[PDB]
């Protein structure tokens, strides 16, 4: 007990004495030791009440209204998974503060005079933090959309049938799998196909865009059409070869490179 007075004889800020109770946690199981510490428990319980009040105030601000959503979008985290991560972090901090209360008051803190309200608030706030509704809604929306990449690679201005959202769904699956939500099998296959076909689609659309701008430049200067006829008919023949192919075709592995190379040549 003299050493537990030297605790305040040495400690300055609340974090250090929190850590001291954490290290000495078993020693307060003794009845005399538990009765020795009475006036500091109220101080730390009030500080934990202040901190959980701060958590409540943070959670009052909606997730889109918070900087968390903006910085999650800036760091490539999709918004639904960003909200899931935000709720999970708030849940983690709530659990950490509950463990801090358990350490400060010792075992049997749920029946303590001050720990009853803390336990009730933690239970209600954890119930409110349940995230399964967000995953259910997102999965329902994605399934109802019924996105599909299968089909011809090209369609006729030239275009490639590959939207940006197909990547966002893959990233959503990527984060939600780590978060432990059981993604459905069909969504997993769609994300798989998205991940495989994304770089080929990027190469194809970049090549089409490059060919479009180069063709516009050539048409704007008609005097130089003859020297560039070979590259023009070569890329047109490759494009015609690509009309019959589908996204499931094995010919895409070299093609999206090879055509692009000729298109790259067609620039120089």
């Amino acid at each position: 007990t003299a050493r537990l007075r030297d605790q305040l004889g040495t400690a300055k800020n609340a974090n250090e004495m929190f850590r001291i109770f954490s290290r000495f946690n078993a020693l307060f199981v003794r009845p005399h030791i538990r009765g020795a510490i009475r006036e500091y428990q109220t101080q730390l319980i009030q500080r934990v009440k202040d901190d959980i009040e701060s958590l409540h105030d943070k959670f009052k601000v909606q997730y889109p209204q918070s900087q968390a959503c903006k910085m999650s979008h800036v760091r490539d985290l999709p918004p639904v998974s960003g909200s899931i991560i935000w709720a999970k972090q708030i849940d983690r901090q709530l659990t950490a503060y509950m463990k801090r209360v358990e350490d400060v008051l010792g075992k049997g803190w749920e029946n303590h005079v001050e720990g009853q309200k803390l336990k009730q608030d933690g239970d209600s706030f954890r119930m409110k933090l349940n995230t399964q509704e967000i995953f259910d809604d997102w999965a329902r929306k994605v399934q109802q959309r019924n996105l599909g990449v299968s089909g011809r690679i090209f369609t006729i201005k030239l275009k490639v049938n590959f939207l940006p959202e197909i990547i966002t769904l893959s990233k959503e699956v990527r984060n939600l799998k780590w978060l432990g939500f059981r993604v459905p099998l069909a969504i997993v296959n769609k994300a798989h196909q998205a991940n495989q076909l994304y770089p080929f689609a990027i190469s194809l659309i970049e090549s089409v865009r490059t060919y479009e701008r180069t063709c516009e430049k050539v048409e704007e200067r008609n005097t130089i059409s003859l020297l560039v006829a070979g590259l023009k008919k070569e890329v047109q023949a490759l494009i015609a070869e690509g009309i019959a192919l589908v996204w499931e075709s094995y010919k895409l592995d070299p093609y999206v490179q090879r055509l692009a190379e000729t298109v790259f040549n067609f620039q120089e």
Binding site: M71, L77, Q89, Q93, F200
Partner: protein
């Protein structure tokens, strides 16, 4: 003592933009390159912007300006090519800018082929020596590629960071130890920090480090060099509201600092002081932790006016001026008191003793 030494901002370029990354030129310490992503309001504006500010002169406007069609998620100085600046973009297309050349368009851009980067590149660095060096770039799909500045058309080397059988790693941050060219550390979106090896029999992910329950935001190795070799220590800041100190040899974190009340988006070691590092959180708060003075409270703290979501922090190679970029494109530069920045002669021994205390 933290005093706002300077206030950098441009109404045309940096307005309505977040600062995606910062970097200082090693040869010219007065220079500061910073990156800015796409403007939300005006699609007519170029998406990625890279601005070079100066500390020698009081010129409010940027010393140099560059831009490119895709949002520049990372930018850096070529440590052995002072006339060049490199930048990784949201499209994955790495871009190069030459100050000698007057073109705002990039002078050299990598392709967007499958072998090249296609996912966003949040991680670009220059590693090697003056006699020879490589531009290492890691994307968010786990793809790592080494390029050469003289030729960005073809990747000099490329592979994928794969660990735990069929599972990629979504690298968010990277770092290299001082004096190390082959080994590095990366931070996944899943919170697991992976120590990886560039070339070797086990090239790829080598070791897993667990403990972070949120995505990693920033990793930095011990850049301070002294008598006692602390190059094996590195710090990580994540979405756990925590800054965790780790040893490369130890698979669990050496220590955790939980004082932050929001996400911690960036942390980095003081380049001169061994035990001092600085982190910046989402409440607009910049916190300098000195482990030779305290371990549960920041040694110094300051709040940025307006409380913007602070994104990035960097130190000067001298170790005094700290430049931090926020979510309003409002780069703010602070000067620290000499009692904090400069280390005492026993700070290394004291740091070793405090590590032994853990």
């Amino acid at each position: 003592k933290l005093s706002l030494n300077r206030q950098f901002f441009d109404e045309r370029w940096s307005k309505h933009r977040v600062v995606s990354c910062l970097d200082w030129s090693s040869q010219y310490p007065e220079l500061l390159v910073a990156s800015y992503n796409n403007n939300e309001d005006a699609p007519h504006e170029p998406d990625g912007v890279a601005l070079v500010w100066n500390m020698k002169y009081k010129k409010t406007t940027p010393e140099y300006v560059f831009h490119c069609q895709s949002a520049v998620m990372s930018a850096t100085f070529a440590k052995f090519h002072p006339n060049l600046v490199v930048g990784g973009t949201y499209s994955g297309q790495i871009v190069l800018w030459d100050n000698r050349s007057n073109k705002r368009t990039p002078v050299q851009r990598t392709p967007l082929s499958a072998a090249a980067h296609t996912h966003p590149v949040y991680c670009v660095n220059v590693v090697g020596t003056q006699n020879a060096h490589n531009l290492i770039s890691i994307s968010t799909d786990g793809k790592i590629c080494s390029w050469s500045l003289d030729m960005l058309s073809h990747p000099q080397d490329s592979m994928e960071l794969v660990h735990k059988q069929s599972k990629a790693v979504a690298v968010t941050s990277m770092s290299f130890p001082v004096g190390d060219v082959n080994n590095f550390v990366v931070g996944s979106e899943e919170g697991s920090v992976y120590t990886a090896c560039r070339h070797g029999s086990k090239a790829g992910i080598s070791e897993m480090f667990e403990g972070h329950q949120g995505p990693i935001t920033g990793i930095h190795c011990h850049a301070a060099v002294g008598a006692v070799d602390f190059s094996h220590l590195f710090v990580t800041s994540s979405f756990d509201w925590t800054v965790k100190l780790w040893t490369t040899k130890n698979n669990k974190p050496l220590y955790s600092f939980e004082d932050n009340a929001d996400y911690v988006y960036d942390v980095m070691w003081s380049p001169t002081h061994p035990a001092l590092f600085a982190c910046v959180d989402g409440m607009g708060r910049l916190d300098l932790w000195n482990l030779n003075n305290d371990t549960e409270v920041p040694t110094a703290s300051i709040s940025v006016e307006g409380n913007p979501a602070l994104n990035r922090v960097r130190w000067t190679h001298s170790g005094r001026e700290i430049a931090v970029g926020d979510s309003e494109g409002q780069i703010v530069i602070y000067d620290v008191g000499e009692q904090i920045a400069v280390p005492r002669n026993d700070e290394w021994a004291r740091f070793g003793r405090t590590l032994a205390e853990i």
